[PDB]
């Protein structure tokens, strides 16, 4: 039986929403991916081993003859020598450094690992950093809070079979992040006609008017949400709610207040 490329997946300062997003994949489903396509060799959310047996599984994967790719979920807390975020008695930054060193490639799943994310938001008590900044290496960023599995699995499969996809100036694959949310929004004609809902209870809101006046950040947000949807059924603006700008770096501080354009 043919070798499957080794993937090591680390969890740092994260909410696990990115792991949850990844398993919402349907092309392929997650079982097919890990039985047939990759060898998922360390993943704290689902792996059978715990404790020293889990740490040994990690060790064995990092020492693997065939090498491995690294997926990082979460930012890195760096205050007090990295001690506010630890696994197996080791600072997260230290373990991520060790794993990244020999990685064939590094994919940052989510805005946290890509850019620092929610824990980096002002006043950043944990001195949290995105991976590229903590490690000083270029990363393949799949941001969003969480990203679409389409984008993450799409990037993983691209990296294994075709090489590094074309990246924008913020490390995001142009395949998925090349276009503004707003440019593909079904409410675009309302926006063009200056037909804005003034409140969520208004007749304008009931009629599906543009949400710009209620703070929609779609005009400054790069992502494919209106085009591919989430869970094959929906997306925030379709559900009547403004875009938060959640694929943009530092959105928690650049895109707030969420319900205003101020």
């Amino acid at each position: 039986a043919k070798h499957r490329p080794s993937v090591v997946w680390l969890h740092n300062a994260e909410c696990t929403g990115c792991t949850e997003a990844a398993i919402r994949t349907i092309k392929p489903y997650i079982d097919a991916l890990i039985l047939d396509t990759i060898s998922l060799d360390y993943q704290e959310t689902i792996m059978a081993a715990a404790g020293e047996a889990a740490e040994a599984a990690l060790h064995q994967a990092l020492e693997g003859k065939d090498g491995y790719y690294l997926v990082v979920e979460g930012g890195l807390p760096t205050i007090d020598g990295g001690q506010w975020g630890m696994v197996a008695g080791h600072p997260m930054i230290e373990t991520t450094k060790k794993a990244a060193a020999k990685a064939k490639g590094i994919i940052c799943i989510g805005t946290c690992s890509a850019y620092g994310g929610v824990q980096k938001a002002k006043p950043n008590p944990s001195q949290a950093k995105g991976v590229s900044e903590a490690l000083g290496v270029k990363t393949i960023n799949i941001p969003g809070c969480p990203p679409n599995p389409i984008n993450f699995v799409g990037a993983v499969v691209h990296v294994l079979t075709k090489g590094i996809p074309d990246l924008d100036e913020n490390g995001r694959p142009k395949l998925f992040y090349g276009e503004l949310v707003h440019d593909n929004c079904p409410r675009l004609p309302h926006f063009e006609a200056s037909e804005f809902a003034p409140s969520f209870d208004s007749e304008e809101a009931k009629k599906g008017f543009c949400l710009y006046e209620l703070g929609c950040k779609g005009p400054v947000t790069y992502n494919n949400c209106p085009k591919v949807l989430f869970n094959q059924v929906n997306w925030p603006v379709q559900a009547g709610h403004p875009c938060l700008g959640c694929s943009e770096p530092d959105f928690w501080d650049t895109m707030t207040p969420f319900y205003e354009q101020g």
Partner: protein, 545 residues
């Protein structure tokens, strides 16, 4: 039996506890093969409460939702209820129904994934599934579960063939170094049950995609829903005929799996591990209730929740007390926070981080220690189950009695790790039984009048509390508004109640207490620690925030 147990005396540390959300280190002292002392040590701090200070109250739900992506939605709901209370707005009926249905959808997704993908590998030896005869397993499946094509000899052989090819490749992936490799005294299942459970584990990976698609019809997306606003919800399309028809159809498929696979597997596992009805119990239970018919105020939520609220102390089912939101406080004595922070009600909550060192017995967790008039409280499915059963809630009375009869155990056997695991299934079955009624209620209502958000005004100064009973238990968000901005915002989260450290009296939390008396068959492979810890469904990002 008897329950296997070594002569081991000495310390055991398990870090990382895998198959949970977040970063937990468990330390125990073992004597003659039983745990005699325990410490629950949460290993990551993010500080969402610090981050929120000074921000727009309308923004809180979007930051707090990212406390956790496993229990996605629940924090957005608790924050929205919280700010709704602070601005004194009563949401429209349709927003109550839509917010509650999204919670229901979250219960089904969360509990299915926990049982199969997080908990089952503690009880199921996947590699022993390879030893099973598929025809024998198919016969057995007929004797423990509803008839279904997925349990046929052909279907179970296909699973076994997939698993065989995978194990024979030498790349064991997520099963690398599993506690069950080579066999394990604490693993009791015949190979046929292992094969049946593994088949369902794989089916559940597909079924949870459907459960999340259901939730997203109303939620906008999953993970991290985007349909709640101050005053109600934004999702007018969620009240219309076709989206609700698809919501129902998907929810019926998920519930078919709950009834055909989850409850039968749970009961089969429970039957084999009946000794676990004597391990891992605690004494005090708290719920804020969920699925209320009146969510106009927190008082009305507590009173009208169809999964009722209550407080049970020292296992006395004869005396369910009302919840006193004024009596909740949090301690930091054994936590990595500055001194002087003990006994704070959440309206006056303080979050001042101060790390010491790994395994400091004086300060050993990033979780605070919530206490209720001086007592630790267990929250979650087991809490809700005992409270509802004590109160004669008819769905709970029936489903609990079914389980007690199938296992031939008294209700006292539920005060245990087996009971904690069983309660999670019990309530999933009951949520399923209510979905069609709840969906019809909202469909008919939304057909007549689609009001979904009420008008409201931001006060200069106010406070509010939002309550929810999330999949893991009693969740509360507390805000002080000043100058129309967040002055204080404190989260007290179900895993904070269950998995926090000792309180100011030195009293163990529920998980620390539950670990006392755990037998360890093999100290090198301490699965029994995992069984009890996982039965609480830990979420350390929720616990610490």
């Amino acid at each position: 039996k008897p329950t296997p147990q070594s002569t081991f005396t000495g310390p055991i540390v398990v870090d990382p506890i895998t198959r949970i959300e977040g970063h937990l280190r468990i330390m125990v002292e073992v004597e003659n093969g039983k745990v005699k002392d325990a410490w629950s040590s949460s290993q990551l701090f993010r500080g969402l409460e610090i981050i929120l200070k000074g921000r727009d109250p309308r923004d809180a739900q979007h930051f707090t939702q990212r406390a956790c992506g496993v229990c996605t939605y629940v924090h957005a709901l608790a924050s929205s209820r919280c700010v709704d209370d602070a601005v004194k707005v009563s949401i429209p009926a349709n927003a109550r129904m839509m917010r509650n249905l999204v919670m229901a959808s979250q219960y089904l997704h969360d509990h299915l994934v926990h049982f199969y993908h997080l908990h089952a590998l503690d009880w199921v030896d996947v590699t022993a599934a390879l030893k099973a005869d598929p025809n024998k397993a198919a016969k057995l499946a007929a004797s423990i579960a509803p008839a279904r094509p997925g349990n046929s000899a052909k279907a179970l052989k296909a699973v076994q063939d997939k698993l065989k090819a995978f194990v024979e490749s030498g790349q064991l992936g997520i099963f690398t170094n599993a506690y069950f490799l080579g066999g394990h005294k604490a693993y009791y299942l015949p190979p046929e049950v292992d094969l049946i459970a593994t088949a369902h584990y794989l089916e559940a990976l597909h079924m949870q995609v459907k459960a999340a698609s259901a939730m997203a019809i109303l939620g906008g997306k999953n993970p991290h829903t985007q349909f709640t606003v101050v005053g109600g919800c934004s999702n007018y399309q969620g009240l219309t005929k076709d989206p609700l028809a698809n919501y129902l159809a998907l929810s019926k498929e998920v519930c078919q799996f709950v009834n055909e696979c989850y409850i039968p597997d749970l009961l089969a596992v429970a039957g084999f591990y009946k000794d676990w009805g004597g391990i891992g119990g605690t004494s005090n239970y708290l719920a804020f209730g969920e699925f209320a018919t009146d969510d106009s105020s927190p008082e009305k939520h507590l009173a009208t929740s169809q999964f009722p609220s209550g407080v049970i102390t020292g296992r006395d089912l004869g005396k369910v007390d009302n919840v006193d939101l004024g009596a909740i406080y949090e301690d930091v004595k054994y936590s990595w926070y500055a001194p002087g922070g003990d006994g704070k009600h959440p309206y006056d909550g303080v979050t001042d981080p101060k790390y010491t060192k790994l395994d400091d017995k004086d300060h050993y967790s990033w979780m605070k220690a919530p206490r209720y008039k001086g007592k630790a409280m267990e929250v979650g499915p087991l809490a809700r189950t005992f409270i509802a059963y004590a109160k004669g809630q008819p769905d709970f009375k029936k489903v609990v009695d079914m389980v007690l009869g199938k296992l031939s155990v008294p209700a006292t056997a539920l005060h245990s790790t087996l009971g904690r695991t069983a309660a999670r299934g019990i309530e999933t079955a009951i949520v399923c039984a209510n979905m069609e009624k709840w969906i019809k209620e909202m469909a008919d209502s939304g057909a007549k009048d689609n009001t979904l958000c009420a008008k409201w005004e931001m006060p200069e100064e106010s406070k509010g509390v939002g309550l929810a009973d999330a999949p893991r238990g009693a969740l509360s968000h507390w805000i002080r508004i000043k100058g129309k901005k967040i002055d204080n915002f404190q989260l007290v989260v179900p895993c904070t109640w269950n998995l926090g450290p000792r309180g100011a009296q030195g009293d163990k939390s529920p998980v620390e207490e539950a670990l006392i008396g755990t037998p360890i068959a093999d100290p090198k492979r301490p699965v029994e620690i995992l069984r009890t810890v996982h039965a609480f469904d830990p979420c350390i990002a929720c616990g610490v925030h």
